[PDB]
């Protein structure tokens, strides 16, 4: 009756760790893709920029 | 008082010896119990030992 609760809390922690890794990966990849797109936008705007 | 002190000196010497050896025997007892526990634990190690290169539990993707 006690080992059940212990195992439950245990598996909960494991699930937390897995979910944290997955969510962090997704967030990281989204941010990097956004940064790359911003970089290309800057590149085209520097091709269009005008002055000296 | 001098006679009592002589007797007490002898007794205290013997007692110091006994106390040291007793404490060391207690130490040895505890260490032998630890060794027994370790001997039992080593039976649960899988054949070929542990894969010390990898993690035991892989708890997330690596994309």
DSSP-assigned letters across all residues of A11-44: HHHHHHHHHHHHHHHHHHHHHHHHHHHHHHHHHH
Query: What residues contact residue B59 under an 8 Å CB cut-off, 6+ apart?
Result: A14, A17, A18, A21
Q: How many CB pairs under 8 A join A and B?
A: 15
Q: Reported resolution in A?
A: 2.9
Interface of A with B (CB under 8 A): 14, 17-18, 20-22, 25
| Residue B47 per-residue DSSP state | T
Contact between residue B60 and residue A15 where contact means Cβ atoms under 8 Å apart: no
Using CA atoms, how far apart are residues B14 and B11, in angstroms rounded to an integer?
A: 5
Using CA atoms, how far apart are residues A37 and B24, in angstroms rounded to an integer?
A: 72
Chain-centre distance of CA A34, in angstroms?
A: 12
Using CA atoms, how far apart are residues B11 and B19, in angstroms rounded to an integer?
A: 12
Cβ neighbours of A25 in B, within 8 Å: 60-61, 63
For B22, the token pair is 């007793």
Question: Which residue has 């010497």 as its token pair?
Answer: B13
Q: How many CA atoms lie within 13 A of B33 on its CB side?
A: 6
For B45, the token pair is 């190690």
- Are the beta carbons of B59 and A18 separated by less than 8 Å? yes
């Amino acid at each position: 009756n006690a080992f059940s609760s212990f195992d439950a809390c245990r598996t909960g922690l494991l699930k937390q760790q897995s979910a944290a890794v997955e969510n962090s990966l997704v967030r990281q990849n989204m941010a990097d893709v956004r940064a790359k797109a911003l970089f290309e936008r800057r590149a085209v705007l520097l091709d269009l920029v005008e002055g000296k | 008082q001098g006679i009592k002190t002589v007797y007490a000196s002898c007794r205290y010497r013997k007692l110091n010896e006994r106390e040291i050896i007793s404490d060391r025997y207690t130490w040895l007892h505890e260490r032998m119990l630890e060794d027994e526990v370790e001997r039992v634990l080593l039976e649960q190690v899988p054949a070929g030992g542990f894969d010390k290169t990898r993690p035991g539990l892989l708890l997330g993707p690596s994309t």
